[PDB]
Homo-oligomer: 497 residues x 3
């Protein structure tokens, strides 16, 4: 047959053409997908992983090249004079930073190669002197003068800023399983957290006072799968932050007695610690793994949290609130286990439409049920039942923990990522399960041989997925053998981990 | 058969265990639900209602006990010196309050037992002197020195702060029908509103200027069933609040001419009135009950609102806006009545899956259709059709009123709790109704005897519901006989009301 | 049969009555819809289009009449003295404006009829002197003294403020297809943008500093079909705006070097240009039409945007970010084209329930499939399949463009209006398609003659739609013949356009 584009073209009277030629396609009906220019992605799936070339800014050690048209070797004060015209805000930021202004320096005692840094730290000191060999830095630059903050930034485990990109982008199913341009933001968000020092105190002011605000975290720590910004913002702490932000002193260091209202940085970067993951009781895959943080074996962590709350509360009150979290989280997993039983039950009875063999292969190249061991739990290229299952465990159950951890009365109960949203999801899942069972029971009785539709398996998007290209020997298992970084438990890792 | 936990345990290789032992359960699959320690709940369902012990902070008259390890009888200045170390922000707050600072006092003329309060009001004056008999106060303390504000705080009817917990937690189906730990936030949110004086001007600063901001209300007045924060925030008033908050004078009293931008407190706590419910035309169960507030019988209320708007507008303009609300609300109920007709029609024809007898009993212990008289309208432990019905009347139709009342052009039409969301919900409900009817018509013709799945009735969560435990003589009807408080019209009340 | 109201009345014991009599109807069950008082709407559908009378404030040239009870001809200083009592904030605003205060004037050189305006511009100068002939102005007043800003405000094409109401309310299907009171906010939002000069710098302060903030745009530029506020707010620009709003100098003019953080006005009202649409590459029906803005034919626009970003960035970085937008948008249309193929496929096979003839006629008066040429793509009064289709193209695919254009890493990928939301919608659409196909295949095999339910066609709301009233010769085609305004491509336009 002819393409969907060809039919639509003859109906709307617009010719079929490539999507990238500048034509304004009516509802994008007659445009054909073209493959963007890619560069090869890194990690264990490097044989087929792709990035857009703009990865140069975020993993510059491996991708950065000269792309400037301006030639010359310059001195710091020449960088400033020309960029005052060419990129004025970069200079205005830098002039308002300690790097570019001695007047706002605090005599911290910054050293490079054992010697005190008493001059201005200018454009050339961070980027180089030669305009045809300009450098785009990572934390490795900052380490030259700020080793303490850098060592802590690099001290986290899996699930922290430290391995956000190197492990949790390059090894992650939802990233490696999709066309590169669909998930550019994933690479960049996670890479900004890992490879940069500007995620909280932005360039070029590098102002710690900015870093202390919730705005230093919420661009990443938000949304459907980890809604801690909204949980915080809908707690009484969050409301007080909004009430007091304009007039409170953000210049004070994060320490006991310096703040009325706690922020993300206050509780998680306690006393300026740049390894914010370490105060957490235990890594729980964003609350998808169940754990009672109030159990005897986690007493030192619970006591540490109680003492943190004791900056501004009774410890009895804090201990009660954290016990409410434990109880609320444990109740929330009963609804997930119900949902799981219903979903896997449909699979075992063979009533799921489509069954795994009726869909496009998963990112491993397998036709495996997503909510079984070895499968890829997901929201795309799968059945409605499986999608609703992923949404139950990831979007809702994990966020119930976040709602309790951040004292959002509403989002624990009624709101986004709450108990009542779990209820409603559970009804959806049972509804989908009942539909599937009634169709199968009818089709059996009348002897109708049901075959799942082709649109579950093929389509313009589904045909782009890398699951189709997967073959034996396409995994770089040496990557997974590495012990200097942790790893995800991928089904095709091929080694221990 | 063996449990879901037992199967999952043998598949993932993690042993089955209690949820509360500290083990990190893989997707919470092999964890068993344990019942948290409870204390008995109050109200008409006290025979089985439970609370977590942390209810001590929110209903302290009935639950507060000594839990301190520090001994001694102290004087105010000793409270301050030690707490300066132990809970520094409480002291910093108190020092910045009128209670703890004579310099910021306004000479209001506060009296206790007829005599002027000219000293500092310290920790011991509110909490007691003996550290083993410390008191956790309610409005009953505040009444000693602030009788006007307390009398107004206690002057509201059902649906106000005055009875938020005593009636609308202890008598409410969605609270009494669920395990206590699932709805801790409900008890606390509603109890903070009723029993405390810190919901708007927080402890320990007790700053009225903080209370005047929308942040004093939005932690409670938000979300899917009452989205007035979002309605306000997406009106031009809300945008102007965000624009002017940082530089406007919040120190001015709530009165005509003192503010450009109106806030929740400005319109609802008119002239500092602590009974904000009373300016409302009529209680309407969060807009779930239809009423034309522009009808001749509500003229005094409509005129009062028009005059409130006239602080900053033409009364003709205000009268027009409030007429738009009346018209928009009346249009919105046509979609609800359509939806109701479709839903109850499915019930009358017996095509709802599950039918009420196929689900777990409701919180009364009955197998009754949720959208009939005597039933419990809900979003959980019920059919998809009934869930979608509850969402239509409560989440959407009630919020259309809120969108119009707060001048949110977008949320009246496109947005959350809008006309267009009602449309989309109505399509969902008709869709569910059509599916149910087509399955029933097929099953009838081929003689398939459909029985609703067991997962509608039993499951790890569904088995915890109190509907199973309900028996004759388990209601404290003496509670419902009380005339000093209003009551909800519960089906098992047993008395008049 | 008797009405739904009559049945409910006999069950709840509340009498049937009109919705507008002031009665508090229990769940609005026994209330009857009454038609509000209307005035005739303007435009090509004037034969049946209606507005509420409050349209007087928003299209005053055609609807404004005297409605004051105060008589007299007054001088400016008499307006102020009385309104200081009657509408105090209007006077307080005006006193704080350049119109009412010479001290804050900047010597701009404002002229009327060629002569300098050196006096105060008072109430009477904008509204008239006679209190029984008071005027409610449009931009036509402002033009007297501010011709530059007015000429630019009137310079936009279709899709801009310039024709928001005159074309995109009066000619739009979703407005003309619904009862007037349901879409009052649509008329007003779009009319405020077109006919007023107070949408960004509100009356009566008319402060440009207020206009520069994102709060000057977000009340309109938000939500499910155009979520640029949320896209901006969840970018690092948005977080920095929230961090710096309170202490930054909003008094500075929108120009290169005056701001660290860019706002809507900064990027779209470049250098104070009051035709913000013109910087856009090409109008794309809110991103529903596909276009590669990085193609050679759009180089001048892409270069202009790169140079705008170069106020604060490298142009290489800006060029890369805008290329990511192009790639991300082009990937997003593959999912829409899949969805479209599935949806129209169901129509061609005749398995859509209801089919177009089973629903109420569309707003043209036709029984036409909404996602075919000549149809009306919509979310209401249509099938679930068609609703989900509209949601795919309008709410999601169009917002992917908005997410990329505003650098929201999260909303490009996980969040509202993202790639992953498209995925989940695509699964919903395929799910609905599979249900429809399985019902049709079963019904065919057993010889069951399915007729779509009556609730798809009739109901209390559906019966109000103007599709029922449409007849030949009810379109004012002379309107569509006009060349001084652009037009929408409506199926019943009757002329070229
Ligand atoms: C040495 C050559 C430097 C390099 C390389 C970087 N920084 Fe720096 N930094 C340097 C000095 C001498 C100081 C001032 C110390 C003082 O006495 O005040 C700073 C300070 C900062 C700060 C704090 C700024 C503030 O206003 O308080 C930050 C947040 C900071 N520096 C960040 C930082 C980053 C992220 C770097 C890598 C990109 C980096 N600096 C490198 C000297 C040097
Ligand atoms: C102190 C009052 C808090 C504030 C303010 C914020 N968070 Fe928090 N968070 C807090 C606790 C007590 C916990 C649970 C830790 C435990 O082990 O008991 C959390 C947890 C999180 C997490 C998950 C960490 C993990 O699972 O180990 C994240 C990602 C997180 N918090 C984010 C976060 C952000 C971005 C904040 C500002 C919006 C924020 N938190 C503030 C307590 C406190
Ligand atoms: C958020 C998660 C951050 C990231 C990532 C990094 N920094 Fe940071 N920094 C952050 C905060 C909230 C503050 C204030 C902490 C406080 O105690 O109040 C800081 C501060 C700094 C400083 C100033 C240190 C001083 O002695 O005053 C420096 C020099 C600094 N940060 C360095 C730095 C570098 C090199 C980082 C990456 C390599 C980096 N920070 C990341 C928050 C966050
Ligand atoms: C920034 C805007 C984000 C985007 C875009 C996505 N991710 Fe993310 N992710 C982000 C945060 C702040 C969190 C931590 C939440 C916490 O409570 O820990 C995460 C976490 C993950 C994980 C862990 C999943 C699990 O094992 O539990 C991974 C593997 C992950 N994120 C990867 C990732 C990818 C590749 C994304 C799109 C393909 C995705 N994230 C989007 C922040 C952001
Ligand atoms: C008497 C022994 C007191 C009791 C008990 C409580 N308060 Fe009080 N309050 C008291 C004084 C003498 C004043 C100052 C009056 C003056 O001249 O200014 C106050 C003031 C307040 C205020 C206003 C604070 C402000 O800065 O404007 C508030 C909001 C307040 N008080 C609250 C309040 C609450 C909630 C109480 C119970 C918990 C309470 N007070 C008790 C004296 C006394
Ligand atoms: C004045 C300009 C208002 C502002 C600012 C806020 N609200 Fe409001 N609200 C206002 C009106 C005219 C109405 C309808 C009253 C009527 O009888 O006509 C409402 C109503 C509510 C309600 C429901 C009250 C009831 O049904 O009786 C609530 C719960 C409410 N408003 C909450 C609320 C909050 C929290 C506000 C700030 C975010 C807010 N309102 C501001 C007018 C005004
Ligand atoms: C929100 C709903 C509030 C609750 C609950 C209570 N208060 Fe309040 N209070 C509130 C506001 C918005 C303000 C300012 C009002 C104004 O006119 O601008 C106040 C103020 C007070 C004061 C100061 C009174 C004075 O004469 O200046 C007091 C003493 C006070 N409030 C007492 C108080 C107590 C005792 C309450 C509970 C028992 C209480 N308030 C609750 C908002 C709200
Ligand atoms: C604070 C964060 C809340 C949570 C948690 C829940 N409720 Fe609530 N509720 C809250 C407000 C501000 C409103 C008033 C809205 C208005 O327009 O009136 C309500 C209202 C109710 C009602 C009335 C229902 C009806 O009769 O119309 C009740 C009975 C109720 N709320 C109870 C309640 C319970 C027990 C909750 C969880 C089990 C629930 N609420 C959550 C604020 C908050
Ligand atoms: C002439 C009779 C006027 C008419 C009619 C309107 N405006 Fe005006 N405006 C006028 C003067 C003399 C000035 C001050 C010029 C100066 O020297 O400063 C203004 C200024 C404004 C501004 C800027 C205000 C600021 O504080 O910077 C705005 C935003 C403005 N005017 C808006 C405006 C609108 C929307 C009008 C129609 C409703 C309007 N003006 C009419 C004189 C005159
Ligand atoms: C500069 C940094 C931006 C800021 C800040 C805001 N927007 Fe934007 N927007 C920007 C670009 C580069 C684009 C794409 C233009 C192109 O042709 O490449 C957009 C587009 C929009 C649109 C659609 C315009 C069109 O399709 O022609 C709208 C409606 C829009 N932006 C709204 C908007 C608002 C309200 C903003 C503040 C919240 C905002 N933008 C800020 C870049 C920038
Ligand atoms: C938002 C889309 C706006 C609308 C609609 C109109 N104005 Fe505006 N105005 C807007 C901004 C963001 C600013 C500041 C621009 C800057 O360069 O920083 C302004 C400013 C004005 C001014 C002051 C001009 C001066 O010389 O200082 C005037 C006189 C003014 N605007 C007039 C005006 C009128 C007459 C409009 C409608 C007819 C109007 N503006 C609409 C934003 C927006
Ligand atoms: C203000 C609160 C709005 C409401 C209410 C509705 N509309 Fe709107 N609309 C608004 C904006 C800011 C945008 C521009 C988005 C951009 O990226 O261009 C629009 C756009 C439209 C369109 C164009 C549709 C298309 O051809 O692509 C029209 C025809 C339209 N809006 C009409 C309209 C009507 C009549 C509404 C309810 C019936 C509706 N809008 C609500 C802002 C707002």
């Amino acid at each position: 047959g002819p393409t969907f584009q060809d039919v639509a073209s003859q109906v709307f009277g617009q010719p079929v053409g490539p999507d990238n030629d500048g034509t304004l396609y009516i509802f994008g009906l007659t445009a054909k997908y073209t493959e963007p220019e890619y560069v090869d992605g890194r990690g264990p799936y490097k044989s087929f992983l792709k990035m857009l070339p703009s990865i140069r800014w975020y993993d510059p050690e491996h991708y950065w090249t000269n792309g400037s048209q301006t030639e010359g070797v310059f001195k710091n004060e020449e960088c400033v004079l020309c960029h005052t015209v060419q990129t004025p805000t970069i200079v205005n930021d830098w002039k308002q930073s300690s790097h570019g202004s001695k007047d706002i320096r605090r005599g911290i005692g910054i050293k490079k190669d054992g010697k005190p840094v008493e001059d201005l730290v200018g454009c050339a000191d961070c980027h180089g002197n030669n305009h045809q060999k300009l450098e785009m830095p990572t934390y490795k630059l900052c380490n030259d003068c700020h080793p303490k903050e850098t060592a802590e930034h690099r001290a986290g485990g899996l699930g922290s800023h430290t391995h956000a990109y190197t492990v949790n982008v390059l090894e992650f199913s939802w990233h490696v399983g999709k066309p590169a341009e669909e998930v550019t933001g994933c690479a960049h968000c996670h890479a900004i957290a890992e490879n940069r020092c500007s995620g909280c105190h932005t360039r070029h002011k590098f102002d710690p006072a900015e870093a202390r605000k919730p705005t230093a975290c919420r661009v990443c720590h938000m949304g459907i799968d980890h809604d801690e910004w909204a949980m915080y913002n809908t707690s009484i702490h969050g409301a007080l932050y909004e009430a007091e932000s304009a007039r409170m002193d953000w210049g004070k260091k994060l320490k006991k007695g310096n703040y009325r209202v706690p922020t993300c940085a206050y509780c998680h970067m306690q006393n300026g610690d740049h390894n914010p993951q370490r105060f957490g009781t235990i890594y729980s895959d964003m609350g998808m793994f169940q754990v009672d943080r109030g159990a005897p074996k986690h007493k030192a962590k619970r006591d540490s949290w109680i003492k943190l709350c004791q900056d501004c509360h009774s410890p009895r009150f804090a201990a009660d609130k954290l016990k409410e979290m434990d109880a609320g989280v444990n109740l929330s997993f009963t609804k997930w286990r119900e949902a799981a039983a219903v979903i896997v039950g449909c699979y075992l009875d063979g009533v799921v439409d489509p069954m795994p063999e009726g869909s496009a292969p998963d990112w491993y190249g397998h036709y495996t049920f997503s909510l079984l061991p070895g499968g890829d739990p997901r929201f795309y290229a799968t059945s409605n039942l499986e999608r609703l299952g992923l949404e139950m465990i990831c979007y809702l159950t994990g966020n119930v923990y976040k709602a309790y951890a951040h004292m959002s009365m509403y989002n624990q109960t009624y709101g986004n990522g709450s108990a009542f949203e779990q209820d409603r999801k559970l009804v959806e899942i049972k509804t989908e399960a009942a539909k599937l069972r009634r169709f199968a029971a009818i089709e059996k009785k009348i002897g109708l041989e049901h075959k799942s539709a082709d649109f579950w398996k093929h389509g313009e998007y589904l045909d782009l997925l890398p699951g189709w290209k997967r073959k034996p020997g396409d995994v770089d298992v040496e990557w997974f053998k590495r012990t200097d970084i942790p790893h995800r438990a991928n089904a095709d890792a091929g080694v221990e981990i």
